[PDB]
């Protein structure tokens, strides 16, 4: 019973931690994509601002 | 006197036979206890090996 309880507890922990990791990675990739959108939007707005900045 | 000693030897035979057959019954119940012990032993040794392997 000692070993069985120990391993079942640690298996519970394994399932929950891998659950954490999956959506952590997912939201990380989503934040990366949104950051790429901010990047391209920044480049475009700076281009517009510099072209308008001539006069 | 011959009849007296005849009867006394007879009653002594009776007592000895009582003791001997009771001892026989006891040894038979003991050897049965021992085989039951041994089969419980094999079962518990097997569950011991199972518990140890799984642990």
Place of tokens 């070993």: A3
DSSP E strand stretches across A1-55: none
Q: What is the resolution of this structure in A?
A: 3.2
Cα separation of B52 and B54, whole Å? Answer: 5
CB atoms within 10 A of CB A2: 7
- Evaluate whether A1 touches B51 at the Cβ level (below 8 Å): no
Q: Are A2 and B53 in contact (CB under 8 A)?
A: no
Min Cα separation B55/chain A (Å)? 6
Question: What's the CA gap between A28 and B6, in Å, rounded?
Answer: 110
Return residues 1-55 of B near A (CB < 8 Å): 54-55
Query: DSSP letter string over chain B?
Result: -HHHHHHHHHHHHHHHHHHHHHHHHHHHHHHHHHHHHHHHHHHHHHHHHHHHHH-
> How many residues in total does chain B contain?
55
Those residues whose C-beta lies under 8 Å from the C-beta of residue A4, and which sit 6 or more positions away, are B54
Interface of A with B in 1-55 (CB under 8 A): 2-4
Beta carbons of B54 and A3 less than 8 Å apart: yes
Whole-number Å distance between alpha carbons of A37 and A41: 6
């Amino acid at each position: 019973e000692d070993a069985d309880r120990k391993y079942e507890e640690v298996a519970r922990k394994l399932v929950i931690i891998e659950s954490d990791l999956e959506r952590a990675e997912e939201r990380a990739e989503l934040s990366e994509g949104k950051c790429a959108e901010l990047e391209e939007e920044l480049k475009t707005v700076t281009n517009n601002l510099k072209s308008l900045e001539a006069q | 006197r011959a009849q007296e000693r005849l009867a006394t030897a007879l009653q002594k035979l009776e007592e000895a036979e009582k003791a001997a057959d009771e001892s026989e019954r006891g040894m038979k119940v003991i050897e049965s206890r021992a085989q039951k012990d041994e089969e419980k032993m094999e079962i518990q040794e097997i569950q011991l090996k199972e518990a140890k392997h799984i642990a």
